[PDB]
Write an enzyme that holds these catalytic residues in place. Structure first.
Site, PDB file in Angstrom:
ATOM      1  N   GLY A  86       0.779  -1.372   0.127  1.00 56.86           N
ATOM      2  CA  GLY A  86       0.123  -0.022   0.138  1.00 56.86           C
ATOM      3  C   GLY A  86       0.611   1.223  -0.052  1.00 56.86           C
ATOM      4  O   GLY A  86       1.981   1.251  -0.103  1.00 56.86           O
ATOM      5  N   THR A  87       0.087   2.335  -0.123  1.00 57.81           N
ATOM      6  CA  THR A  87       0.790   3.666   0.018  1.00 57.81           C
ATOM      7  C   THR A  87       1.236   4.038   1.344  1.00 57.81           C
ATOM      8  O   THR A  87       0.988   3.418   2.384  1.00 57.81           O
ATOM      9  CB  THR A  87      -0.224   4.926  -0.545  1.00 57.81           C
ATOM     10  OG1 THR A  87      -1.177   5.267   0.497  1.00 57.81           O
ATOM     11  CG2 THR A  87      -0.851   4.519  -1.936  1.00 57.81           C
ATOM     12  N   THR A  88       2.250   5.078   1.411  1.00 53.73           N
ATOM     13  CA  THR A  88       2.878   5.489   2.668  1.00 53.73           C
ATOM     14  C   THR A  88       2.111   6.362   3.460  1.00 53.73           C
ATOM     15  O   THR A  88       1.277   7.323   2.874  1.00 53.73           O
ATOM     16  CB  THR A  88       4.073   6.159   2.405  1.00 53.73           C
ATOM     17  OG1 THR A  88       4.878   5.719   1.287  1.00 53.73           O
ATOM     18  CG2 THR A  88       4.925   6.340   3.584  1.00 53.73           C
ATOM     19  N   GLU A 119       0.133   9.535   1.619  1.00 55.47           N
ATOM     20  CA  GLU A 119       0.284   9.569   0.128  1.00 55.47           C
ATOM     21  C   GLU A 119      -0.822   9.230  -0.636  1.00 55.47           C
ATOM     22  O   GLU A 119      -1.303   7.904  -0.399  1.00 55.47           O
ATOM     23  CB  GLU A 119       1.590   8.881  -0.175  1.00 55.47           C
ATOM     24  CG  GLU A 119       1.870   8.686  -1.799  1.00 55.47           C
ATOM     25  CD  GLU A 119       3.089   7.777  -2.009  1.00 55.47           C
ATOM     26  OE1 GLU A 119       3.513   7.811  -3.136  1.00 55.47           O
ATOM     27  OE2 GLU A 119       3.152   6.632  -1.144  1.00 55.47           O
ATOM     28  N   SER A 140      -2.599   2.095   5.682  1.00 53.78           N
ATOM     29  CA  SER A 140      -2.022   1.725   4.403  1.00 53.78           C
ATOM     30  C   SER A 140      -2.404   0.176   4.295  1.00 53.78           C
ATOM     31  O   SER A 140      -2.381  -0.437   4.997  1.00 53.78           O
ATOM     32  CB  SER A 140      -0.474   1.794   4.615  1.00 53.78           C
ATOM     33  OG  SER A 140      -0.099   3.262   4.806  1.00 53.78           O
TER      34      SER A 140
END
Ligand code: CL
Ligand code: MG
Lengths: 250, 222, 241, 231, 244, 243, 240, 235
Positions: free
Chosen positions: F29-31, F46, F74
């Site tokens: 996943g994204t940060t 993010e 995330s």
């Protein structure tokens, strides 16, 4: 979520065996030796107290348990399974008998109720069988003294004397030579201690041995006086000191 | 099936040209015993609505918690919670109205009479009533309990129909409300001298006035 | 071989899921120790905070179950907290139902019974934790009772748990062979804590700063944990002798 | 492989294959397009038949006077989910006298789809949805995936060969976003968008399905001779 | 989920057999043989105990023969624990009928219901069947003396003479040979013991490895008596027929 | 083997492979990050701009629980929403019975026990999210991070997602350089910088920054989103540092 | 509750549990139904590996569902009791609400519906039973014969057989049964039924059961000697 | 094994796809829609000559304005018909009107996907639902165990379907009379059937606005069979 295991975990194999019951009996074989001997005026049940660590207090772990004032139990196999069976056995003696008839159940019927509980763990959904064999000794007015064995399957058999667990094969043979129908309770205690020494390896004293009797009524252990018909429990756990006294004249 | 224990008396209100005014005294009665004197019976929801409640106070406090929870729930996953998707007076009312009628239908009512006063997003005045039976109605003036019998006649002399609303200023309207509160203190055996008053205007917003007293009383004439 | 996935017997009468739950016990790589004084029961456990970004005050494996009972866990924190919450709830209910504080040994039995059920019922996994309960019981006095994933439980004169448990166990055994008694013959709990840390240092062979340890103390009518400065005060006393 | 027997199982790389297989059912479905300006939102859908003797499977469903969607994948699943939206829109009206925000509609669909991906016995929904609406914060377009993921967009497309329309809308973004106060032009842009996903077949009178909602326009669907204007 | 560990106890084989029922019957074939013989003036029940130990308490023991009511008894072959579950159900069912109609339950009705319970465990519930076969011996005023057998499938049939458990094939042949319709109880007692003595897996048939029972009208006038034989009585009847 | 096919099954190591597999979904996943400050906490995330067609500022990922707690996560986004929905139920029942808003440590264990419960049975799947969350209560500020196994701790700073290691390194520098403490407004600026620095690990698609904060002095102890002038100021501070 | 879907489709579009239930029927003893001009006859095989049987008390193969309808079967005996019980209860329930006994078609439709329900319900296996249901509708003299099977399908037959070697006896009936002229009397119908079983049975001793149903609740079971006379007569005409 | 509600890698439900194979094994059923009415015809297919063919019931009334033909595991259809009849009558009770043919079909199709781990498996039968209502006139629907339904001008289901459907593609036009449709169903059934078509092994039916749903007699169909043979010989 929720128990999705609504199906049997014990089933018949092509040869006709019930695998989980067989494997439960294997767990009992690994367990520490325990025995029971029936005398004319009493019954003795005994076992070794296998300590897990010398820092452990083995007095806090009781292998021989009171079920009713006239009934006691001992086992071979898995301790935790035995512990919860004693809890359930103590309760069922009240719910399905004492709360109905105002008296404690006779040995054969309490044994029958424990056997039922163990049978259901063999057929009900999402459970394994109990990994223990029980020896239940007791007394009641109309049947006198009796001794029963209960296996993981739920089967129970009455015995004059027997042993279960680690060295049961040798212990049963020893008991066959010594048992007669004229044995007095003190003679049965003596034979119990002799039989147990064969299977015990390390220390053999009142602190490593657990032994109880079903014998005469004990008015001193009742806790009250005034009712003539109430005469006290026939179940008594022998003390560490009482065992050592008998180990000198062994 | 209930019976009310600690109770609050009249809640009175009216529309004026730019908004609405609502008032209620600070008393919590216990039968004939005037037991509690610091009770606030007007509860603001956001900056555009005030809910005035009479009847059982334990049930009022329950309704307080429901409205408090409604504000919390509306803010969830709502970037426009303080803008286009803020709680309107009409939403708050319909919710309470639903609850009141459901409770009466389960034979376990919230023992209250409620007036929701506010201003909608388009500037329109909102004023509507609901009670323990789930009965709802709207009018240029609204009042509960004794207020219905004594305040309404006085407030209807100022705003008798819809066309009178644009012709009524906030000064004239507040004067009529404050006068009505004095009359209720004269004549209601469960009123107190101390009261709260709230104005919700489409220009100046929510003005909440606490610790007001009834004054300029005529007795000198026995 | 599905007999290794759920809690049914294997051909040799074993429960592998129970055995593997025992191995999860050491997953945190932390050792704990418990001893008894005349008036008290002391429990100590290692405190390892590897990440610099962690708030060290929130890293704990000792729990205050009730006013009188404390519990240290050896095992992963999720299962540890699961056991703690249940124990707290059980102790609270006991007091409400029976009108007196739940004894340490009775709570131990109850939690052991719950663990036993997970070894017999299929849909529930065992918790990968070993629970050590401590108190000064009003009937039995200073008490240490310990539970495992098999549902086994027993009282202890003293005990240790963790990867290097055996070294600590024998160290304690050898002391009680020498002293000839069931406890630490000491008046104050402060010196019983000092004994506990001293004998852990000898057995493990490591030195401890104030942030490397975690101490719980049970006295009559209360169980409490020590702060970093309480432990530091205790560390200074050992060093000056 | 060994980890696709049910939704309750993660793969060693952290994938849910049953959810991915449900996603695959959308890709086989007929193309549908969504786009909006600041005043209106438009759905365009290519309908599919069994043969020349059959009708053309309806793709667009009305949820409320201000909201509705188009579907791609298992149609019965779209019926279940649209019915749920109809109820949620309705609950909001009856209880709060409030038109359900298009954003909340998305949040509700997300959470309904999610529960079917974490429990034993169930299965993921096998359909993708494009939700359009006009609420208190203007026009909206949402994209629903049965993984649970809901996304707000200016324009988009799902189904077989949806990438063609999705690229076109990505180029046309600056043009069609400012088609305010002109329904027929916003539809023309959507009909031109869906044309980028056609192969061997062209838009006929019983093939095309258009829906529109906006500032002064209730959610209404056009079929048959009513879409002849746009071919 | 849990699908992985489901044995599916209630399904058909490709040949149209029920796996678990067939395997339960295989289990029962290793249990001690039990025989029932119906005479014109009574019924005999005879059963062999499973390999006994000398320290077993023989008099206060029950393994094979159980009393359902005053007019009906059963011989068991299979898991004893399973049988006791079913016996208690049967005992209760008999009392329900007596409470409802004020008449002792007809034998077949009791047999049908117990058999219907067994049937249920083979069609639904996902549980293992009961590993038990019964021989029912009883009397009622409609059909008089009756013998029935039921097995894990829940199928039951009536008999003049029948065996269950081990060596049924050999036992049935021997019964088919020497049985005749005008037979008396004392003759049937002899046939039962003679058959067990020839089919037994033991060296010699003795009193301590047997359970025995009769259901006669040999009480006083028009009423039925159940006799569960004591150890000494089995010792005597074994001498009287010259087996020991 | 087969020990990894079913949730709640112990491997011979003593591990639950299904949970470890859920961790892989989180790492994908994204940060997202969390910074603890003088009198509060700051959250940032993010948001990958997949297409021009995504409406800016309109796919909000940070979520509020009650009025004083913020949550960001995330991994599987739907799984995170399920957890927050439960968090909101837990916080509501606490406030219902006890009146006071739920303390952060109390709230942390509510999520912890719930996530831990999804490792006990084979009929449920573990959560595919690591959740960073916190807020201000009567005892000051608290920041937490919760993982699929149910494990959680308190943090000075926290990070998860594809750029977790980059963000962790940057967080450790702030802890070392500011022993006395970081201010709320400073922590917002730093959060922007760290997300931009952590974006190097996801640099194909460009992204959209989203920040929120709770502070005793700056937001009066309530959760608010950072928008407008304060957001653009934080973006500019971050842009200056990457060059 | 136990939920498992035991009856499911296979890649080729078969439900194997239903098809395996048909194999259980194929294993069962043969049963035959023949309807005449004014009667229906149900014949049943009984295997002779069981001597020392008590025929007084042993469950009969043909069961009365009501006073005017009968049910025979092939397959698992234990399974058949459950269907018979349910049918008997529905028979009394119909009389109670409609104030008229069941038609043979209705009773058949009910039994078939039960069988179907066990093919798409969770936690249950299909019935390993096929049935022949025969009788006369209330105030009607037209003979009725129906057949059901595990899948749930049912249909009417002029004559039909089920069980082991049923394909052999069906072959016999197909050339020996004239649709234009069904067995005009009771004797003719019983003889054709006994003849058809003698193609498969063995000895005509205690192996064949015959039950005759006539209009207005007139049902009787033949004894050994009565059946043996048909066996004796058929064999003497055969030697030609 | 595997879950009952499992998706294949191609995005289809295994159990639904397998039930479609069971339907291909079923007997042929054909429907044709005209402006004068809708005709429904089926192949009876008796497994043996001793079976009384008039007891084979594969065309069925749902209401006076709606009829139904089936193909596949026909025992599975009983509960579907039961639901359809209840739905139709219940709507008439609630709204004092006839229920739309499409609404009926949608109600039946709602049952279809209600299986899993609700019933244990999908239905193994396909239905042709034919009827009339005031809004959309004469209609023919094909209802599948997938929960999907298509409206058709003409449709064949069962073992002879793909061959019969290709024939229906050529023969159907928007001006067919009822008599023309009757003959067309007989013609196409005679082509795809194994045994020779007659009045005993095939059954016709229709639904008209005026007379409602009617199953034809064996005498009436026999004359249409004779009329069909004469017309094919006449050129
Ligand atoms: Cl307990
Ligand atoms: Mg388990």
């Amino acid at each position: 979520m929720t128990d999705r295991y609504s199906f049997s975990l014990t089933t018949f194999s092509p040869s006709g065996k019930l695998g989980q019951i067989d494997y439960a009996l294997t767990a009992v074989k690994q367990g520490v030796t325990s025995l029971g001997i029936k005398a004319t005026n009493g019954v003795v049940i005994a076992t070794e107290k296998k300590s897990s660590s010398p820092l452990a207090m083995s007095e806090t772990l009781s292998k021989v348990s009171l079920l009713t004032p006239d009934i006691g139990a001992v086992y071979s196999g898995m301790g935790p399974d035995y512990r919860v069976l004693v809890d359930k056995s103590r309760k069922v003696a009240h719910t399905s008998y004492k709360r109905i008839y105002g008296e404690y159940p006779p040995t054969k019927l309490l044994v029958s109720e424990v056997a039922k509980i163990m049978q259901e763990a063999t057929q009900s959904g999402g459970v394994r069988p109990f990994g223990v064999s029980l020896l239940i000794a007791g007394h009641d007015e109309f049947n006198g003294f009796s001794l029963y064995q209960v296996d993981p399957s739920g089967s129970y058999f009455p015995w004059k004397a027997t042993a279960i667990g680690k060295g049961s094969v040798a212990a049963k043979t020893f008991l066959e030579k010594r048992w007669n129908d004229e044995l007095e309770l003190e003679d049965a205690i003596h034979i119990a201690l002799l039989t147990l020494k064969e299977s015990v390896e390390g220390e053999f004293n009142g602190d490593t041995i657990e032994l109880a009797i079903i014998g005469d009524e004990n008015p001193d252990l009742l806790g009250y006086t005034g009712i003539p018909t109430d005469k006290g429990p026939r179940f008594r756990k022998l003390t560490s000191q009482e065992i050592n006294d008998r180990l000198e004249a062994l | 099936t209930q019976q009310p224990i600690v109770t609050g008396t009249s809640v009175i209100s009216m529309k004026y040209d730019n908004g609405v005014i609502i008032a209620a005294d600070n008393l919590g009665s216990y039968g004939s015993l005037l037991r509690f004197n610091g009770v606030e019976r007007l509860i603001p929801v956001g900056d555009n609505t005030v809910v005035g409640i009479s009847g059982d106070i334990s049930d009022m406090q329950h309704i307080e918690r429901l409205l408090k929870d409604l504000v919390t729930e509306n803010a969830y996953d709502n970037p426009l919670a303080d803008a286009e998707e803020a709680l309107e007076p009409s939403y708050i009312f319909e919710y309470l109205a639903t609850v009141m009628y459901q409770r009466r239908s389960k034979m376990n009512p919230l023992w209250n009479a409620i007036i929701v006063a506010g201003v909608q997003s388009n500037g329109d005045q909102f004023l509507r009533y609901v009670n323990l039976l789930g009965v709802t109605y709207s009018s240029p003036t609204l009042a509960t309990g004794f207020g219905a019998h004594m305040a309404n006649p006085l407030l209807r002399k100022v705003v008798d129909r819809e066309s009178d609303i644009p012709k009524t200023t906030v000064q004239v309207a507040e004067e009529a409300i404050v006068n009505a509160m004095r009359v209720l203190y004269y004549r209601d055996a469960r009123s107190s001298r101390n009261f709260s008053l709230a104005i919700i205007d489409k220009n100046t917003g929510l003005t909440f006035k606490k610790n007001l007293q009834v004054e300029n009383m005529k007795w000198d004439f026995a | 071989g599905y007999d290794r996935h759920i809690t049914i017997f294997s051909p040799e009468g074993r429960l592998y899921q129970v055995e593997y739950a025992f191995k999860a016990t050491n997953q945190t790589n932390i050792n704990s120790l418990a001893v008894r004084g005349k008036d008290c029961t002391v429990v100590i456990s290692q405190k390892k905070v590897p990440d610099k970004l962690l708030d060290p005050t929130t890293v704990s494996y000792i729990f205050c179950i009730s006013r009188t009972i404390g519990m240290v866990v050896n095992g992963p924190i999720p299962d540890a907290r699961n056991a703690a919450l249940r124990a707290k709830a059980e102790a609270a209910e006991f007091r409400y139902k029976y009108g007196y504080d739940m004894p340490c040994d009775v709570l131990a039995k109850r939690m052991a019974n719950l663990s036993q059920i997970y070894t017999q019922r299929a849909y529930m996994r065992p918790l990968g934790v070993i629970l050590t309960f401590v108190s000064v019981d009003e009937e039995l006095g200073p008490s240490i009772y310990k539970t495992d994933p098999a549902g086994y439980y027993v009282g202890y004169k003293a005990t240790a748990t963790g990867p290097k448990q055996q070294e600590i166990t024998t160290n304690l055994e050898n002391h009680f062979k020498k002293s000839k008694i069931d406890h630490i013959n000491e008046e104050s709990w402060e010196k019983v804590v000092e004994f506990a840390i001293t004998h852990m240092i000898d057995a493990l062979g490591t030195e401890f700063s104030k942030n490397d340890l975690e101490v719980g103390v049970a006295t009559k009518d209360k169980f409490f944990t020590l702060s970093a400065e309480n432990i530091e005060e205790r560390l200074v006393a050992i060093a000056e002798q | 492989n060994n980890y696709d027997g049910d939704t309750v199982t993660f793969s060693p790389t952290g994938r849910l294959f049953q959810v991915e297989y449900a996603l695959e059912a959308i890709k086989q479905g007929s193309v549908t397009v969504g786009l909006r300006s600041n005043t209106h939102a438009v759905l365009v859908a290519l309908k599919r038949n069994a043969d020349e003797l059959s009708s053309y499977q309806k793709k667009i469903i009305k949820c409320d006077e201000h909201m509705g969607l188009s579907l791609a994948g298992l149609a019965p699943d779209a019926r279940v989910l649209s019915n749920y939206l109809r109820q949620q829109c309705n609950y909001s009206s009856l209880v709060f006298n409030r038109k359900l925000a298009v954003e909340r509609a998305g949040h509700l669909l997300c959470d309904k789809a999610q529960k079917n991906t974490q429990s034993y016995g169930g299965r993921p929904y096998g359909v993708g949805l494009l939700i359009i609406g006009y609420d208190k914060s203007g026009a909206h377009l949402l994209e629903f995936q049965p993984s649970g993921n809901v996304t707000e967009l200016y324009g988009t497309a799902i189904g077989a060969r949806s990438q063609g329309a999705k690229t076109y809308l990505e180029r046309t973004l600056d043009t069609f976003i400012k088609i305010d106060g002109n329904p027929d032009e916003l539809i023309k842009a959507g009909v031109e968008a869906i044309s980028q996903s056609l192969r061997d077949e062209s838009l006929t009178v019983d093939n095309l399905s258009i829906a529109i909602v906006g500032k002064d326009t209730p959610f209404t669907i056009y079929d048959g001779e009513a879409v002849a204007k746009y071919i | 989920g849990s699908r992985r560990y489901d044995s599916r106890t209630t399904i058909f084989s490709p040949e149209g057999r029920l796996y678990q029922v067939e395997y339960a019957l295989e289990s029962i074939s290793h249990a001690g043989t039990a025989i029932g013989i119906m005479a014109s003036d009574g019924i005999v029940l005879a059963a062999e105990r499973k390999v006994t130990s000398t320290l077993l308490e023989q008099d206060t023991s029950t393994e094979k023969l159980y009393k359902l009511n005053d007019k009906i008894a059963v011989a068991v072959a299979g898991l004893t624990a399973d049988a006791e579950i079913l016996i208690n159900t049967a005992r209760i069912h008999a009392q329900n009928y007596l409470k409802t109609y004020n008449e002792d339950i007809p034998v077949e009705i009791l047999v049908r219901r117990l058999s219907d319970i067994k049937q249920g465990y083979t069609q639904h519930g996902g549980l293992r069947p009961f590993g038990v076969s019964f021989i029912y011996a009883g009397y009622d005023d409609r059909y008089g003396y009756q013998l029935y057998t039921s097995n894990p499938s829940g199928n039951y049939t009536g008999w003049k003479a029948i065996s269950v458990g081990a060596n049924t094939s050999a036992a049935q042949t021997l019964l088919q040979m020497d049985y005749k319709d005008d037979m008396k109880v004392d003759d049937a007692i002899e046939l039962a013991l003679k058959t067990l003595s020839k089919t037994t897996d033991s060296s010699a048939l003795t009193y301590d490895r047997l359970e025995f029972a009769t259901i006669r009208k040999g009480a006083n006038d028009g009423e039925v008596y159940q006799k569960i034989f004591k150890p000494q009585e089995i010792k005597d009847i074994l001498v009287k027929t010259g087996i020991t | 083997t087969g020990y990894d096919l079913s949730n709640s099954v112990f491997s011979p190591d003593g591990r639950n492979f299904q949970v470890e597999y859920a961790v892989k979904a989180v790492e994908n996943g994204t940060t997202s990050i969390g910074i603890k400050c003088n009198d509060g906490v700051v959250f940032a995330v993010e948001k990958l701009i997949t297409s021009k067609l995504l409406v800016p500022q309109k796919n909000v990922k940070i979520q509020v629980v009650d009025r004083h707690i913020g949550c960001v996560y995330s991994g599987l986004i739907p799984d995170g929403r399920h957890l927050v929905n439960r968090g909101r139920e837990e916080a509501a029942s606490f406030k219902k019975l006890y009146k006071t808003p739920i303390p952060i440590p109390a709230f942390a264990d509510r999520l912890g026990q719930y996530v831990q419960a999804h490792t006990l049975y084979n009929s449920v799947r573990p959560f595919g999210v690591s959740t960073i969350f916190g807020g201000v209560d009567k005892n000051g500020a608290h920041l937490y991070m919760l993982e699929p196994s149910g494990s959680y701790w308190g943090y000075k700073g926290a990070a998860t997602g594809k750029g977790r290691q980059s963000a962790k390194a940057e967080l450790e520098k702030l802890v070392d350089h500011h022993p006395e403490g970081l201010s709320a407004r400073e922590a917002v600026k730093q959060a922007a910088k760290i997300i931009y620095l952590a974006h190097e690990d996801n640099k194909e698609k460009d992204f959209e920054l989203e920040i929120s904060w709770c502070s005793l002095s700056e937001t009066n102890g309530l959760h608010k989103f950072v928008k407008g002038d304060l957001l653009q100021e934080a973006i500019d501070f971050a842009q200056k540092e990457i060059n | 509750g136990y939920d498992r879907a035991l009856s499911i489709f296979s890649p080729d579009g078969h439900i194997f549990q239903v098809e395996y239930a048909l194999e259980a029927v194929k294993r069962g003893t043969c049963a035959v139904g023949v309807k005449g001009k004014n009667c229906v006859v149900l014949g049943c095989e009984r295997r002779s590996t069981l001597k020392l049987q008590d025929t007084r008390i042993t469950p009969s193969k043909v069961s009365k569902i009501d006073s005017h309808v009968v049910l025979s079967f092939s397959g698992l005996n234990a399974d058949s009791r459950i269907l018979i019980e349910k049918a008997r209860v529905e028979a009394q329930s119909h009389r109670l609400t409609l104030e008229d006994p069941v038609t043979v078609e209705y009773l058949t439709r009910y039994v078939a519906g039960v069988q179907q329900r066990y093919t798409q319900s969770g936690g249950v296996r299909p019935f390993g039973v096929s049935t022949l249901i025969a009788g006369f509708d209330p105030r009607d003299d037209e003979p009725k014969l129906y057949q059901t099977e595990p899948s749930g399908i049912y249909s009417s037959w002029s004559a039909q057989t089920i069980g082991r070697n049923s394909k052999t006896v069906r072959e016999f009936l197909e050339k020996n049964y004239d649709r234009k002229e069904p067995p005009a009397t009771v004797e003719e119908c019983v003889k054709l039924t006994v003849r058809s079983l003698l193609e498969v049975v063995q000895t005509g001793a205690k192996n064949i059961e015959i039950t005759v149903v006539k209009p207005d609740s007139d049902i009787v079971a033949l004894s050994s000697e009565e059946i043996n006379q048909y066996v004796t007569q058929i064999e003497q005409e055969k030697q030609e | 094994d595997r879950g009952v509600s499992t998706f294949s890698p191609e995005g289809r439900l295994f159990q639904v796809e397998y039930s479609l194979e069971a339907i291909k094994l079923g007997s042929t059923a054909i429907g044709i829609a005209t402006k004068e009415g809708v005709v429904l015809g089926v192949e009876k297919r008796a497994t043996s000559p001793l079976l009384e063919s008039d007891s084979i019931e594969k065309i069925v009334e749902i209401d006076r304005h709606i009829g139904c033909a089936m193909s596949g595991l026909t025992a599975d259809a009983r509960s579907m018909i039961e639901h359809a009849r209840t739905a139709a009558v219940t709507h008439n009770l609630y709204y004092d009107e006839d229920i739309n043919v499409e609404s009926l079909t949608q109600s039946v199709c709602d049952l279809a996907l209600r299986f899993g781990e609700l019933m244990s498996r999908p239905f193994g039968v396909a239905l042709l639902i034919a009827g009339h209502d005031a809004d959309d006139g004469y209609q023919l629907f094909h209802a599948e165990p997938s929960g999907t339904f298509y409206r058709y001008n003409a449709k064949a289901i069962g073992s002879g379907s793909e061959g019969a459907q290709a024939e229906l593609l050529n023969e159907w036009h928007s001006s067919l009379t009822l008599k023309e449709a009757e003959l067309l169903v007989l013609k196409i059934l005679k082509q795809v059937m194994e045994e020779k078509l007659d009045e005993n092994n095939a059954q016709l039916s229709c639904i008209t606005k005026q007379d409602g749903f009617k199953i034809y007699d064996n005498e009436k169909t026999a004359e249409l069979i004779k009329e069909l043979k004469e017309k094919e010989a006449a050129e």
